[PDB]
Design an enzyme around this catalytic site. Sequence first.
Site, PDB file in Angstrom:
ATOM      1  N   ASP A  76       7.351   1.192  19.930  1.00  0.00           N
ATOM      2  CA  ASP A  76       7.022  -0.044  19.171  1.00  0.00           C
ATOM      3  C   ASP A  76       5.545  -0.424  19.347  1.00  0.00           C
ATOM      4  O   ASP A  76       4.953  -0.835  18.341  1.00  0.00           O
ATOM      5  CB  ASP A  76       7.953  -1.202  19.560  1.00  0.00           C
ATOM      6  CG  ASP A  76       9.270  -1.224  18.790  1.00  0.00           C
ATOM      7  OD1 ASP A  76       9.518  -0.265  18.036  1.00  0.00           O
ATOM      8  OD2 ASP A  76      10.047  -2.214  18.932  1.00  0.00           O
ATOM      9  N   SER A 115       4.981   3.131   8.275  1.00  0.00           N
ATOM     10  CA  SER A 115       5.086   1.853   7.529  1.00  0.00           C
ATOM     11  C   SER A 115       3.968   1.761   6.477  1.00  0.00           C
ATOM     12  O   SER A 115       4.291   1.569   5.280  1.00  0.00           O
ATOM     13  CB  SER A 115       5.137   0.627   8.419  1.00  0.00           C
ATOM     14  OG  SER A 115       5.652  -0.478   7.654  1.00  0.00           O
ATOM     15  N   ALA A 116       2.702   1.876   6.887  1.00  0.00           N
ATOM     16  CA  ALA A 116       1.559   1.774   5.940  1.00  0.00           C
ATOM     17  C   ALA A 116       1.184   3.141   5.345  1.00  0.00           C
ATOM     18  O   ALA A 116       0.546   3.153   4.290  1.00  0.00           O
ATOM     19  CB  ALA A 116       0.374   1.127   6.625  1.00  0.00           C
ATOM     20  N   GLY A 117       1.478   4.249   6.022  1.00  0.00           N
ATOM     21  CA  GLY A 117       1.083   5.595   5.547  1.00  0.00           C
ATOM     22  C   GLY A 117      -0.370   5.976   5.913  1.00  0.00           C
ATOM     23  O   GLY A 117      -0.923   6.849   5.239  1.00  0.00           O
ATOM     24  N   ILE A 118      -0.919   5.468   7.021  1.00  0.00           N
ATOM     25  CA  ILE A 118      -2.320   5.746   7.452  1.00  0.00           C
ATOM     26  C   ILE A 118      -2.401   6.004   8.956  1.00  0.00           C
ATOM     27  O   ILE A 118      -3.264   6.799   9.334  1.00  0.00           O
ATOM     28  CB  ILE A 118      -3.306   4.630   7.001  1.00  0.00           C
ATOM     29  CG1 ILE A 118      -2.972   3.243   7.559  1.00  0.00           C
ATOM     30  CG2 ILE A 118      -3.393   4.576   5.505  1.00  0.00           C
ATOM     31  CD1 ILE A 118      -4.041   2.168   7.301  1.00  0.00           C
ATOM     32  N   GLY A 119      -1.587   5.338   9.788  1.00  0.00           N
ATOM     33  CA  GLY A 119      -1.695   5.427  11.261  1.00  0.00           C
ATOM     34  C   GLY A 119      -1.041   6.680  11.826  1.00  0.00           C
ATOM     35  O   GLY A 119      -1.736   7.739  11.965  1.00  0.00           O
ATOM     36  N   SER A 135       1.039   8.627  10.261  1.00  0.00           N
ATOM     37  CA  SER A 135       0.910   9.621   9.177  1.00  0.00           C
ATOM     38  C   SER A 135      -0.448  10.349   9.329  1.00  0.00           C
ATOM     39  O   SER A 135      -0.533  11.604   9.137  1.00  0.00           O
ATOM     40  CB  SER A 135       1.016   8.926   7.821  1.00  0.00           C
ATOM     41  OG  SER A 135       2.314   8.380   7.558  1.00  0.00           O
ATOM     42  N   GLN A 162      -5.471   4.323  12.897  1.00  0.00           N
ATOM     43  CA  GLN A 162      -5.564   2.830  12.821  1.00  0.00           C
ATOM     44  C   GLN A 162      -6.214   2.237  14.088  1.00  0.00           C
ATOM     45  O   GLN A 162      -6.667   1.079  14.014  1.00  0.00           O
ATOM     46  CB  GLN A 162      -4.178   2.190  12.612  1.00  0.00           C
ATOM     47  CG  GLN A 162      -3.772   2.107  11.152  1.00  0.00           C
ATOM     48  CD  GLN A 162      -2.426   1.438  10.947  1.00  0.00           C
ATOM     49  OE1 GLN A 162      -1.371   1.915  11.389  1.00  0.00           O
ATOM     50  NE2 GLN A 162      -2.453   0.308  10.260  1.00  0.00           N
TER      51      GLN A 162
END
Length: 279
Positions: free
Chosen positions: A181, A216-220, A222, A262
């Site tokens: 988390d 969730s956002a597709g950047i971190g 991912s 991120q």
Amino acid sequence: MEMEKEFEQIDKSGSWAAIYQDIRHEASDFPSRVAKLPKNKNRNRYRDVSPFDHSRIKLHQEDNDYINASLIKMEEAQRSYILTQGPLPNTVGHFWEMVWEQKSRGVVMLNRVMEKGSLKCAQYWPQKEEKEMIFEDTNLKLTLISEDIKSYYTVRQLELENLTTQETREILHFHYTTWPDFGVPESPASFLNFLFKVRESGSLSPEHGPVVVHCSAGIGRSGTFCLADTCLLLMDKRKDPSSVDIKKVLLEMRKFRMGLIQTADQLRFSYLAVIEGAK
Ligand SMILES: CC(=O)Nc1ccccc1C(=O)NN
């Protein structure tokens, strides 16, 4: 400069925050005009995470072709990835339309449906064999075929049917279930083994469309997945694996989607993944 030495030098100096901000400062900035159209506001999970217009995936319909997804094309590595957000209640049909249209073999999911007591993405796949899902807006049917649950990851065999043509395809769902988390894993052992399970599958291979990867956002998370894959394979290819500059690969990938990696902890973990992966 051998990245293992660069690593110890940044760690002893504790300059991870300073390296990370240098990347943020030099990163590409391109227009995202389609993402910010008012008709697309409910197609976006986060207001500050948008696909660039030059690299966005287009849905093959005349109505509205928009989805929060980007094609990352790595020319020297000869790999392609689609990076997308966790589907929303109103974009689950769009998500499976994209998987169909782009001919992907695999979906990689790096988050849980619920984290920190909040919903991070829709329940977009069926949990029981005999309770299939139908997406009426995109005319697709999805059935759970089999499920293999391990300690760090679960692999699912899904059948996706184009109800218009009655063609079917097998899609593999690779779900990493143990990213914590807060922060990043202590050791990349289980992340690396997950990555080499996705490769084993054929999902990353040029005989299929690009893999779809999401958190969730597709950047971190991912971002971490496709940076490590690309960096390792460049090391397998070039006559000098020490010439592989992870910061330069990340800036190249950031020409195609904003914000990849991120935090300074995710940047350090990526190094740890490539460093350990090279052994
Ligand atoms: C280059 C490397 O060390 N790859 C792996 C890393 C961690 C776990 C498994 C593998 C592997 O190779 N699997 N077939």
